[PDB]
Amino acid sequence: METNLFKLSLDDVETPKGSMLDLKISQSKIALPKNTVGGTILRSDLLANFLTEGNFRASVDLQRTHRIKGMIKMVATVGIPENTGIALACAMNSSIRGRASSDIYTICSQDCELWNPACTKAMTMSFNPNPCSDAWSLEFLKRTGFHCDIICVTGWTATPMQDVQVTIDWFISSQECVPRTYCVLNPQNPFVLNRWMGKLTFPQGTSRSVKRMPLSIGGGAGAKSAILMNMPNAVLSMWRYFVGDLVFEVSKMTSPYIKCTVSFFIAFGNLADDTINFEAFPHKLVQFGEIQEKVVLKFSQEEFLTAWSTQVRPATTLLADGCPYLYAMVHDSSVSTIPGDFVIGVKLTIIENMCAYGLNPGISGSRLLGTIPQ
Amino acid sequence: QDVQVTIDWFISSQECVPRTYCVLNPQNPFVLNRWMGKLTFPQGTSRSVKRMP
Amino acid sequence: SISQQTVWNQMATVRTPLNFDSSKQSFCQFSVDLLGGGISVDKTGDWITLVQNSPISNLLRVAAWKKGCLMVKVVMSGNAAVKRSDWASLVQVFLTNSNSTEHFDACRWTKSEPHSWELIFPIEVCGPNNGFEMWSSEWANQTSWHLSFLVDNPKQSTTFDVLLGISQNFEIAGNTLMPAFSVPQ
RNA sequence: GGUCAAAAUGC
RNA sequence: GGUCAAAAUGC
RNA sequence: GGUCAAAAUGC
């Protein structure tokens, strides 16, 4: 008539499996006050504090399970009409050491995604918090500093009628965690860099409103009296000279109602803004579909002859750069029927088929990178 | 200004098929078609929760 | 791989208090957190410290997970008006993972070379993730690498310069989200 | 490269 | 009849 | 289930 406790199944060390419902760990509601200006920290905390925000089916499983060999899945949601737009981002970095920066340079290297709710009414990011292995723990997330920053990069185009709320659904995924380590002296391929290369703003009118971006990319971001930094750059700067194929990601952050055809090419800084003749250069013309927000741009390694310098002193006059630049131009005009400024953000996602000849002793600080209102 | 809906009426190429109801021996799928409500959600961040019997 | 010879890069430059009263003792004391990026100092004086916003210095401050071998170099540039028959200074160097008295020393060097000395040695970062370590994290009551110093007649053995170099096998992963580094002038 | 999206619906 | 117990352990 | 939509255009 007796029961053996020993042969009871109370000692199962396994990763939660189930339906997207069953594997729901939390529900965070984030607030998007209609007077939001851009560069605004909507909520910066600890992941573990983000996940511990509701009692949902695998919630205790998150807390009373020591090894989770699956992935944190976010599902965000806020709908905004087509005559306005906000540019939000979820940045997950691996630790915070103090009163840290919440730019976008500084918070987009590990795993972060930008989205204009007017175009993308529901985003889903998945990440692996221990970039070094295949499992995580809540206590890990807790006692290590895993951070989640939710910021506005380019504020409202049109100010909505009342406040808004972004609801992020958090879950554990059905897919395994895969590492992403960096050997600093023997890079991989494709090398993951993820660099905010700039927030390009084109005013309304018939101005070629030509934006030039340095292709020298070590030290990182400039600050008044300081340098801003993210690992994927830290390491790059460990090298001296570089080449490869540069893959850029152009995102629209303004309201699908602000129109422009933007022309991208590759040149040098010695050219005047009135150079009729550039479009006689390899160039690619970009145009955004109403609800289209991401154009991926690929420049091949054949657009560069010789490797270039990883760093160039900050004063080096647009007449002395011997390093290739990434020029963006208005091929037509900026046109709208509502006040607004066309804003598109550029992020260097991966350098593919890289070649790094060298080792950089260093050069003090770096130059500035675009930003501004809304 | 004002608007006008123009309805075009026609006789169709397709046959008429009955739909009768036995009240004590329903069919399947039973056709009910019931206005279960006009749910109105004001602008803002209100869970503006609507419950229907 | 990716390599170049004799290209090391700067991290530390510690200078000794000028105001030092050879009366409340003979020595001055200081430490460098190699894997953290912080110079901790005495209350002996007004110390002049600088950490260099180097490719590496820069890198180690930002990279949350560290596995591998780094190369260190400490150089003593001293007071050269002091006549070599008149030298009274040693400088005791230590290598620990905590700034605790209860922790024990890894390596221990003591150098007493007039006006200048050099010291080249390997440090290796071994940790609990997959062999990866995080700066003084509570996770596996984790630690670092510290290079502390003790200067006797600090008016003589005046300046200290710390350089490190990287190993073909240094691997990082993750971003320790850090404030803006301050750049002089 | 990861992520993501996609390879579509009804009884 | 249900339940339960049982058809056993170690690297 | 009905309805509806759809399985697409040009000489």
Swiss-Prot record, chain A:
Compartment(s): Virion
Coiled-coil ranges per UniProt: none
Swiss-Prot/TrEMBL site (Cleavage) positions: P373, Q374
Top-rank taxon: Viruses
S-S bridge residues: none
Transmembrane regions listed in the UniProt entry: none
Site, as annotated: Interaction with the viral RNA: K17
Description of its domains: Contains a beta-sheet structure called beta-barrel jelly roll.
Subunit description: Interacts with the small capsid protein. Homomultimer; assembles as pentons. Interacts with the movement protein (via C-terminus).
Stated role: Together with the mature small capsid protein, forms an icosahedral capsid (T=3) enclosing the viral positive strand RNA genome, with a diameter of approximately 300 Angstroms. The capsid is formed from 60 copies each of the large and the mature small capsid protein. The large capsid protein interacts with the viral RNA.
Protein name (Swiss-Prot/TrEMBL): Large capsid protein
Highest classification ranks of the organism: Viruses, Riboviria, Orthornavirae, Pisuviricota, Pisoniviricetes
Full-protein interval shown: 447 to 820 of 1018
